[PDB]
């Protein structure tokens, strides 16, 4: 069931069936995907990133651990991704605003999660739109997972380089996340301060579905809201 690829094993686990590696893949997914967005939308300079490959034919730019400021951001995502281990992370989103830091956003890259009770078949709750569809999505093996990753990244690159208009010369981008209902009230992610507001969207804004992720015991759905569309 595992993946037969050395290039893939450089970034992601070859196995994604058991609960721990399913969570591990999501951790790496968050890191890889959101790194690509930060570069492709030019929110950080090229220096923060290092060149990596998902497959031999596909390259991506991942936050380099040798840059101290990029390493700090990489740990934001690592910490966020860790909340997927125990099913406490509902949504993590890259939120772009005019001023730091408004509730209403300009551009949002959202990754929403769904967890599974046992065996990776039944949705868990953990919650209370695409929730319905994403819950019905079934694990189809690691090869399906690799395709999902490749698809998402090709789509992010394409969306940012050939669909979206370049961001304004002045903005502020930060990561905003939402905890699940299962999460303890004492539960906070290191680097993410409390807040009474998440993010809001202007009524006329346009959304496009970037892709999905379905490992053994997790499910992710990634979208994009931007005036740049």
């Amino acid at each position: 069931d595992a993946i037969d690829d050395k290039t893939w094993s450089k970034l992601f686990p070859s196995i994604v069936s058991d609960p721990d590696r399913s969570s591990n893949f999501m951790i790496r997914a968050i890191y890889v995907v959101f790194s690509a967005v930060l570069r492709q939308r030019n929110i950080l300079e090229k220096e923060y990133f290092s060149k990596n490959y998902i497959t031999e034919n596909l390259s991506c730019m991942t936050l380099s651990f040798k840059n101290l400021r990029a390493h700090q951001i990489a740990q934001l995502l690592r910490a966020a991704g860790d909340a997927t281990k125990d099913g406490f992370l509902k949504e993590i989103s890259l939120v772009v605003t005019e001023h730091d830091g408004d509730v209403e956003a300009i551009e949002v890259f959202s990754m929403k999660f769904i967890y599974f009770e046992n065996g990776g078949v039944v949705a868990r709750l953990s919650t209370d739109p695409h929730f319905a569809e994403l819950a019905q999505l079934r694990y189809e093996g690691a090869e399906s997972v690799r395709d999902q990753m490749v698809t998402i990244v090709r789509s992010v690159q394409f969306l940012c380089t050939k669909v979206l208009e370049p961001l304004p010369a002045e903005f502020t981008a930060n990561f905003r996340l939402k905890y699940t209902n299962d999460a303890p009230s004492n539960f906070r992610i290191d680097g993410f301060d409390d807040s009474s507001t998440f993010y809001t969207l202007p009524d006329g804004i346009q959304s496009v579905t970037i892709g999905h992720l379905r490992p053994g015991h997790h499910a992710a759905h990634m979208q994009c809201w931007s005036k740049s569309m």
Binding site: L177, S185, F192
Partner: peptide, 17 residues
């Protein structure tokens, strides 16, 4: 300590021009 909301915000990344 109890948490008021299910939200968490990170440090921003700004650009001025």
């Amino acid at each position: 300590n109890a948490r008021d909301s299910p939200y968490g915000l990170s440090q921003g990344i700004t650009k001025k021009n």
